[PDB]
Symmetry: C3
């Protein structure tokens, strides 16, 4: 079964692993075996997750030094402004789809909890200007060691920009030393992309195991008003792809169906690992060897988008806030639901690219409409129900969190003529 596994096409092999993993997970769940999946299956998932985690800092660091030196700082800034306008725009849209979809499913209207005028609590802000200053690393080695992507993006861009100015200086010796430094990062970056390719041969096993574990643990839990939550959240995400991404893709002259075909590996590992950051190496390699995007773009947009652009998380928080407000019988007035638009965008910007991060940031969004997490209050009680299904919901939103990054990257890269069109012609 070494020849039987490797020769079968890898397009449909990661997908075979997902489907069979999900059913295997569901059968283990109704029948009560989820503990064995956690023992004898999940480690294979865990192994696959680690192999991807291992590549994030080198590949983000090296691709961005190389990419930032490959494009004038004038265009880099132009790429920054565009991707951020794409990012906030599609994120706002995601919160919009969240609320509409939630109203249509009448989420949490059968929960029937009582409540009262909320308990007055002094709101911690939490404070933004420190969040921005912390983008600037004080010790870039420590940032590498602590795995901080956003400060590393900052150092990487700075060094890459500095390297080019040096290679154009008059003194021959400065040119060769700067080139030598750039080749080291290029050699490392080319070596990282290569290793991502080898790991993706194990991905069906890891994907199978990851989905098997999640489906066995939390499948039993999608039953009641939570089933209505799960069904709403996935409906909304779909619309964010099918309307927002496709229309935006089609408007800019990218075939949406070819985009989804190329993006799938980024989408499926985003799904089972439920970490945008942990999935980043797959996303970037899709951008290079599938989408045809230049390293001078996706080396910036993708690691940045993995953190600040989450349409999936933004939409998941839209749906569930309505759940809590309906579960306690204090439905959100229309003027309240507009505040959600602003504060969900912010919360999704601020969630980490790691499993579970969005459900915690949901609390900030609840506190913004006047629903406080005071234990053991009924608002705190509804919030607990949402946490029960969180993995089931995390898979979906992590996938849309990463997909929107690719859709934006390909769209921005097209308008900059850094997209390689030979990769999109059908034959």
């Amino acid at each position: 079964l070494l020849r039987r596994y490797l020769d079968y096409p890898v397009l449909w092999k990661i997908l075979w692993g997902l489907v069979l993993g999900a059913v295997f997970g569901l059968i283990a769940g109704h029948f009560g075996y989820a503990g064995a999946v956690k023992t004898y299956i999940k480690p294979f998932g865990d192994l696959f997750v680690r192999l991807l985690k291992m590549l994030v800092m080198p590949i983000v660091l090296a691709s961005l030094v190389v990419g930032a030196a490959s494009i004038s700082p004038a265009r880099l800034g132009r790429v920054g402004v565009k991707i951020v306008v794409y990012y906030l725009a599609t994120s706002a849209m995601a919160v919009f789809f969240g609320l509409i979809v939630g109203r249509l499913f009448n989420v949490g209207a059968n929960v029937n909890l009582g409540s009262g005028t909320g308990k007055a609590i002094e709101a911690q802000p939490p404070s933004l200007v420190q969040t921005l200053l912390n983008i600037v690393p004080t010790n870039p080695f420590a940032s590498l060691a602590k795995g901080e992507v956003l400060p590393v993006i900052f150092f990487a861009i700075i060094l890459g920009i500095a390297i080019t100015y040096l290679m154009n200086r008059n003194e021959e010796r400065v040119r060769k030393s700067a080139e030598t430094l750039l080749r080291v990062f290029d050699g490392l970056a080319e070596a990282m992309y290569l290793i991502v390719g080898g790991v993706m041969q194990y991905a069906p096993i890891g994907v199978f195991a990851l989905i098997a574990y999640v489906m066995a643990e939390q499948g039993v839990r999608v039953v009641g008003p939570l089933a209505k939550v799960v069904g709403a959240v996935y409906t909304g995400l779909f619309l964010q792809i099918v309307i927002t991404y496709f229309i935006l893709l089609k408007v800019f002259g990218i075939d949406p169906i070819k985009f989804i075909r190329k993006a799938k590996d980024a989408m499926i590992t985003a799904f089972v690992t439920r970490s945008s950051s942990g999935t980043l190496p797959v996303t970037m390699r899709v951008a290079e060897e599938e989408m045809g995007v230049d390293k001078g773009i996706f080396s910036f947009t993708l690691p940045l988008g993995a953190t600040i652009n989450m349409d999936g998380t933004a939409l998941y928080q839209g749906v569930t806030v309505l759940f809590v407000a309906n579960a306690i019988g204090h439905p959100l007035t229309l003027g309240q639901q507009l505040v959600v638009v602003l504060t969900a965008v912010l919360a999704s910007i601020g969630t980490a690219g790691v499993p579970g991060a969005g459900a915690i940031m949901l609390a900030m969004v609840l506190q913004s409409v006047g629903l406080d997490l005071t234990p053991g209050s009924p608002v705190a009680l509804a919030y607990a129900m949402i946490l029960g299904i969180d993995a089931i919901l995390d898979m979906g939103r992590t996938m849309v969190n990463v997909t929107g990054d690719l859709a934006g990257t390909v769209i921005v890269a097209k308008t900059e003529k850094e997209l390689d069109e030979s990769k999109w012609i059908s034959h």
Copy 2:
């Protein structure tokens, strides 16, 4: 208003931010708006500090590998003996000015606290040998990530010395691989020096906010006998520059007025950041692109000096120990006043290159003459007053801390003739 800032000459621009920040802070603080300074002004300073901090480890590491490869270990060792002989010599001189000036200002004679005969406490053993053994890093990657300058100095010197012996090898491949590695550090260090320059275009703004905030918070507290302390410390610091450094520079045939002219960016950044380590990239760049010192000198002396050479701190401990001993009515006998000379030199050596460290190390100087920090005893109370004005005193003392590093580097480089004499003529 943003359109006149760039065209105005960037020669002295960093000094206007210093004065106008000092004046703006003194006014806003006296009006009870010192809180507004802290909110809307200080972050621009905090940004200028982070951008400099991010460069300390890369630039210290890369400049010292490159420099140590460019010089003979016999000479470097000789440079070591010279710079260390200069370092403690001028520090001893600084404690001397502290005591004289402090006596001249009769610091703390209006305090009138009235303590009794001292109490004996340690209560913990101090350790010097471990302090030396800690010069040798156990994990140089860990040392980089923890931002420990002296273990990096040790490892970098070794790697640089090692590279040249490899480039002198009889085997073509070993020469080429060592050449390749040296070009990496050279390319990296050249990129760090470029970035320090770009940051310094922002330095006026960063300088303005830092001074503004310090003046706003602590301006109001320079009123009582603490004003006499402030006046003594700055008078002494002035003398350390004007007598010790000028005579030493002039004895060795360096123009003192031109020296202060080149050092100003380092001097003002030390003043406002109150961190020798954080100012190091500005200091080293001053030493490269202003003084004309070779990397074989300043890439060793300057990071070393940022820790072990503090004349400013040594003198601040002279003045303030006299303040505390006079404030409690137990003035220092001359033989105690001589112990301060030795123990401030020791305390200044062991003081970190980061804000506030010398006021902690002050405690040891007190415990050496018999003034113990037992709470709530009067020694602990006088010490507390000194901490109240500490930022105002840190700005001055940090500036003299790096200035002596430059003066020693320029003097040492001259005696070894790695100082480039073409920068000090006008043509």
Copy 3:
């Protein structure tokens, strides 16, 4: 004068430091000055340990990227299979001598404690599947900074393998950039081996000071039934070298006496520092410039062996399980002594390469045969006696731990035709 010491040939000079150092330390122990040794001598030994520590991550990372890129992955796996088979074989064999040598000395039969039937700790469970998974680093920068050797071995091997495939591509640019990167690691590894050479000029002093402090503290403490332990462990370790290693070395056609002659720098450094990982740069350098092994082998086997292959530790735990069981009047039945073989091998595999780690993992071996560490029970009382002499036993067992790694590396390297015979030709 410094100028006289530095010019004396280092062949036997590290040995003069060990021999004079051990003797010196013994004198202060009977004479009650061992506190002054800890003060005015030991810092020179501790300095020698820090300088070797600073080279471990650079030399392991750089040598293995270089080495792993110079050998086909197909062959690297075969090195892996061979060295692991040697490792489990010789580790078991070491535990076997541990029991033979240990019963021969009748260890701890005069102690005469209670103990009665013990009370049972059913916690903690050993965790493996995780321990294996953590071999894959999640952040290689984090692994370097935290000094985690095994994940760095994993990352470096992967990177070495990838660099080679890259130098084989069509585009000049990919060839050229991958070539550039390889040379950086090549320059770095070559610089590390050089610096190990300089540190070995200080090593006689460091060796003197380390063994002096150990003989000074724990010298007074071999008077008892513990003296029989010191004698057994050292007897066994000796047998592990002269029987197990020598017969194994000779089968494959390596002169055993030349092996000990070249290995001595690593053996004495493992002995005094009591850290296999701390001694690694000497071990790897002895392997390069003395044994003549290629970086494509010793850069893998030696860092891997520094953790998972400990024959000294395996034989040490064999000896002391018998000590504890006889001390309480519950001598080990034969079937218990078979469990030890499996579980001492497992425990030795899991023992860290740092001082004292083997006495801690000893608890895992006792806990397998029913001798439980519940305080203040008599079993816990015997274990305390073993910890009292632990340094004396650690010096010896760390040496056999490192010696076995070299013997395995040289044996495997011969069967792969990577050993350079001009170093062995008389």
